[PDB]
Subunit: 314 residues, 3 copies
């Protein structure tokens, strides 16, 4: 299938500006040029133009409710339109809040989708469980069918319809979960693999297990939402919430590598790359670079090597 | 059970001063503040006042014999007293010599205890095997029942009584063993897991195996003696003998995590944090931080997250 | 058996000068001094004197064809001579091209040998598949029985006789394979373990597997050719083609440690240590030091420790 890159230069999901610069950074590092060189057809849709919503009064504790909700509706419309034409959507963030419009727009055309969430955090805090009014920590709360009506109506998200049930999402890389969020996953029985399970089983067993758990009897589309902070800070330092002890550069490449093998990758998010938080210019190139490597891996690049078929090299 | 932190700001176990500053460093980093927020009752016993022993002439090659012995007798009395009151002892070093009075004081109330020793070194050198007269490399020699009368009588340890047999200690993280020490563990048949065994089996298999080997038929109390240099120098650089190729931040957190699960942790040592050996102020914070992280892990903190029971978060 | 170190201060196999300084760097770091302290007899054969071949015109695209072939014929002669006298050969590079004269000279005395190649690269490019005319990326191509007559006759390699078949070589550490090389290994069915297989299986499973694959029914001599770049750049930075996401210091030590245990190590190469590519003097010592550690591991040094037999330490 072909591919369509969508830039989502948004940052209202948290106080730290800088993330709207993620897609620029990634593009300038040669993302699209490199994607063309694979067996995939690549089209660059460009960057979406977001606009501030006037007098965006905080809803209780939640900041920039309407801005985020508006941004996400617009994104969801773009995603689903591109999806309809039979293409694999690739979204560049931007903060985690853009996960909302991505999975919504995807599910409109594929209600039988499943989400694989690589991150150090669950981002499953509701407007009532949050200690921060930042929406980048609440995307999975606006998407679950079992959490519908468990928290009020935030101004801006009226268009949102819970598109997946807890029984459809797997978490890999958890190491900084809030009490409220950990409750919701214990209660709703969401399948996860925090760092402890990774140490216990190995990345191999992890992929081996997430797969059967989702594609066991019914094979379905895969939506991989990748938060750059899921890997260790020594690999991807330019992010808003670096947390020590994460997945290694090798583990991140393995996750995506297996995802390719299934051939069901239908959507993909590359969130939280904040080019401005690099303690040095080098820390920025390091982060950007692994994000680009992660994206090429999902689209065919293997570490054992690659070569075009129908071409005798000897 | 409740907890009692005991500081042992002692450094006569080696030439490099600075280790006596470990408990200060750790306290200032918020150790006790964070322990209180767990399901345990915490009491800060304060720092022990040690005094130099006048004209502490070197015993053959062993330096500061009496100062160390005295320090440890005093520590053993404070541990056993606190132990008696049904509490979990937590010792902050200080160099490894304080391992002596810690295990002695512990065993006085629990002669059926077992020692889990995380370290890159065995510290089983006797006054006759030692190339250095530093007692921080000999603590396990003063505690073994099979080594009793295998080396003379050092001035100051006449009070010491071999409290464990070689069949009761397991080592994890060995990568810098002297010929004499390796001979003793080979001959005495001490169960260990050097880095090669960890590479071979994985951390899960290591804990899976140290457990059954000790709590196989008879469950007993556990005393975790943690030397900070067991982890890799890129995690805990502020220590006296950093050795390349160690356990990772993730592996250290996994060891401690499984220890919690058994519910048998009865004593705990956090040795060798030397705040003065940080090449930069950042290498000090890093070390300090992981030692604090390791401590909280033993007392309930999990990576998957935590939450208080009897409190509906939804 | 005894050991003989042979320096191969050659660098015409690539543009980056500096590698010819590898053996010096390694000797100055005390390599031979530390080798003596093991259970092996050590003799330092010294450094080979190579000479430029006048008007060494490029063969099609292959640069310095005759210089490389000459150096390698001379090396092959020195290796086989040393091997004839019942000694384990140890070659210090130098660029990867020297792998040619080493395996050739070894096989002259042990046609039944097998090769374990630790590298991020396969170096199996032929004069026709190469995008560069550098001979450091083609050593395995001049050695395979299945590739004989599949590429023309390079001026200088007429003396070479394909000594091993694809069914005799195992690759560990691949993460940067060209299309033509990946074709040759898929076609010829060469056994390998790129980084993904290591992630999937663990180093233990890799060694457990490469061994039976070679020593299954017929045990035979082992020739370990070690490319310093097979480990991660954060361990061995001073090399010509660092590729991120490699084997760790712990994994490298484990490979070599298991090799010792079989007792079949008959030849060994330590290629690609370029002392002039260190961003700082510290990056050089780091690299040099791990190569030295890798060498000592192959000859008896274990992480659990060692001690001389027939010597009561108590
Ligand atoms: Mn995150
Ligand atoms: Mn996230
Ligand atoms: Mn110790
Ligand atoms: Mn130690
Ligand atoms: Mn290489
Ligand atoms: Mn090579």
């Amino acid at each position: 299938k072909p591919i369509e890159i969508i830039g989502a230069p948004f940052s209202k999901g948290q106080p730290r500006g800088g993330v709207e610069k993620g897609p620029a950074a990634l593009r300038k590092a040669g993302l699209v040029e490199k994607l063309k060189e694979t067996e995939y057809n690549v089209r660059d849709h460009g960057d979406l133009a977001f606009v501030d919503v006037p007098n965006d009064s905080p809803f209780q504790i939640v900041k920039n409710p309407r801005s985020v909700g508006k941004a996400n509706e617009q994104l969801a419309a773009v995603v689903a339109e591109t999806q309809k034409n039979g293409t694999i959507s690739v979204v560049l963030g931007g903060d985690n809040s853009m996960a909302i419009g991505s999975i919504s727009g995807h599910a409109r055309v594929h209600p039988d989708l499943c989400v694989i969430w690589v991150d150090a955090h669950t981002d499953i805090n509701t407007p009532l469980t949050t200690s921060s009014g930042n929406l980048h920590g609440q995307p999975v709360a606006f998407l679950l069918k079992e959490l519908k009506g468990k928290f009020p109506d935030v101004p801006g998200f009226s268009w949102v319809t819970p598109c997946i049930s807890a029984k459809d999402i797997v978490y890999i890389g958890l190491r900084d979960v809030d009490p409220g969020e950990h409750y919701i996953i214990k209660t709703l029985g969401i399948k996860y693999f925090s760092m402890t399970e990774v140490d216990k089983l190995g990345i191999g067993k992890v992929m081996e297990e997430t797969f059967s758990y989702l594609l066991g009897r019914k094979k379905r589309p895969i939506h991989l939402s990748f938060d750059v902070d899921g890997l260790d800070p020594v690999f991807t330092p330019a992010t808003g919430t670096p947390v020590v002890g994460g997945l290694s550069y090798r583990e991140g490449l393995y996750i995506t590598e297996e995802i390719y093998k299934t051939g069901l990758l239908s959507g993909l998010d590359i969130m939280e790359v904040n080019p401005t938080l690099g303690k040095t210019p080098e820390e920025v190139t390091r982060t950007v670079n692994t994000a680009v490597a992660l994206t090429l891996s999902c689209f065919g690049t293997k570490r054992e090597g690659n070569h075009k078929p129908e071409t005798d090299y000897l």
